[PDB]
Design a protein around this ligand. Structure first.
Ligand SMILES: Cc1cc2c(cc1C)N(C[C@H](O)[C@H](O)[C@H](O)COP(=O)(O)OP(=O)(O)OC[C@H]1O[C@@H](n3cnc4c(N)ncnc43)[C@H](O)[C@@H]1O)c1[nH]c(=O)[nH]c(=O)c1N2
Length: 375
């Protein structure tokens, strides 16, 4: 039996970020089922940062994370965590009212957000079919996140603070014993006053082991693929391109193009594989919007974006289950919100007020709590 102050289940971006901030204050042990911490959703994302995405809570958590991403502590990473990648949202269906509403809402959080005419959008991504383009919004402040460096920075930070990150440690049994939570894995047993449930799409399964009422988390499959651009076009500086109705996105990645139908098909938590229909739909939508020809994609994959009913993230203690803390419902936002989520969850776990910089973005206990869910 190994004792800790905080026992975290899951070493994806959620558990790693929460563990990182906790590790400054006590002994953290993170238990991870897989052989590597980023095998599931955290290693399968499109890795983009944009404030104007998701619910108001998500936008606040994303905005509040930028300070850390732009100024992490010395030794956290070797190179910047963010690289410039503006986002251009293109109207392909001639909906000027919706385009205006997205522009106005985005500009309220991003003063530099711009409204583009069709010619401006096509100047930026010249493969757009001009007769299908009706205008766009443009966020000059978007960025790509180096997920590997961020995730490894969190994990290394735990270990440098005398915490432990234990892979091949699937939590199999969980029990409240003598005022603490005890977790049995095949390799070893662990005890801590606080159990942090950061198990991604499996958070409700972890609650099931513990006898704690689950949240109603719904994992949803999203597939993506990479394909080669035609030999004559340099697309490496293109923005992240999204359609106005979120039917697809397309962004440069490692000399290739990364596409997705931006799907969200509800599934059980599992090691999710891409579906042929997903890939074909994404290819069709990109070929409908652009002059690109997509041959058989060179690599395809899928990951899970897991949501509760209201689309907001969850960080808070369970009602009626002492010491059981949810870090859940990251949706499609877990990487871009991870700095604010990690710092806020650590404060809440420790029963401390949220730091002032988070409060200035409108973050508080109530907006994050699982107890807002009803019934
Ligand atoms: C295609 C695509 C594209 C994007 C995105 C997703 C997808 C699929 N996302 C979303 C992002 O991927 C998602 O929000 C986070 O990776 C969720 O991180 P978690 O740590 O919650 O889950 P994650 O699945 O990474 O970690 C949970 C961990 O818990 C472990 N676990 C489960 N059960 C266990 C047990 N019994 N014992 C021990 N360990 C256990 C798992 O093995 C797993 O490693 C995204 N986000 C974003 O911010 N920007 C973006 O651009 C995108 N884009």
């Amino acid at each position: 039996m190994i004792e800790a102050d905080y026992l975290v289940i899951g070493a994806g971006i959620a558990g790693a970020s929460t563990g990182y901030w906790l590790s400054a204050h006590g002994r953290v042990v993170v238990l991870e089922r897989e052989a590597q911490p980023g095998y599931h959703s955290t290693g399968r994302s499109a890795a983009h940062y944009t404030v104007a995405y998701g619910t108001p809570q998500v936008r606040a958590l994303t905005a509040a994370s930028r300070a850390f991403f732009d100024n992490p502590p010395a030794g956290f990473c070797e190179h910047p965590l963010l690289s410039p990648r503006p986002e251009m949202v293109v109207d392909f269906s001639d909906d000027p009212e919706e385009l205006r509403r997205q522009y106005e809402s985005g500009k309220a959080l991003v003063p530099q957000m711009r409204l583009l005419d069709a010619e401006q959008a096509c100047s930026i991504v010249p493969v757009l079919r001009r007769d299908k383009v009706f205008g766009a919004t443009y966020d000059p402040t978007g960025a790509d996140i180096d997920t590997d460096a961020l995730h490894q920075g969190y994990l290394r930070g735990i270990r440098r603070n005398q915490g432990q990150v234990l892979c091949n440690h699937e939590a199999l049994e969980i029990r409240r014993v003598d005022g603490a939570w005890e977790v049995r894995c095949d390799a070893g047993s662990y005890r801590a006053a606080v159990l942090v449930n950061a198990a991604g799409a499996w958070c409700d399964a972890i609650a099931g082991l513990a006898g704690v009422r689950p949240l109603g988390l719904q994992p949803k499959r999203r597939s993506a693929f990479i394909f080669a651009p035609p030999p004559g076009i340099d697309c490496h500086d293109w923005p992240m391109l999204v359609s106005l109705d979120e039917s697809f996105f397309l962004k440069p990645d490692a000399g290739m193009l990364l596409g997705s139908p931006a799907n969200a098909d509800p599934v059980e938590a599992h090691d999710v594989q891409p579906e042929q229909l997903d890939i074909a739909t994404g290819m069709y939508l990109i070929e409908e919007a652009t002059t690109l020809t997509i041959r058989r994609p060179e690599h395809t994959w899928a990951g899970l974006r897991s949501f509760v009913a209201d689309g907001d993230l969850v960080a808070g203690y369970a009602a009626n289950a002492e010491g059981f803390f949810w870090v859940a419902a990251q949706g499609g936002y877990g990487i871009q919100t991870s700095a604010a989520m990690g710092e806020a969850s650590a404060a809440l776990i420790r029963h401390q007020p949220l730091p002032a910089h988070l409060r200035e973005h409108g973050l508080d206990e109530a907006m994050l709590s699982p107890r807002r869910l009803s019934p």
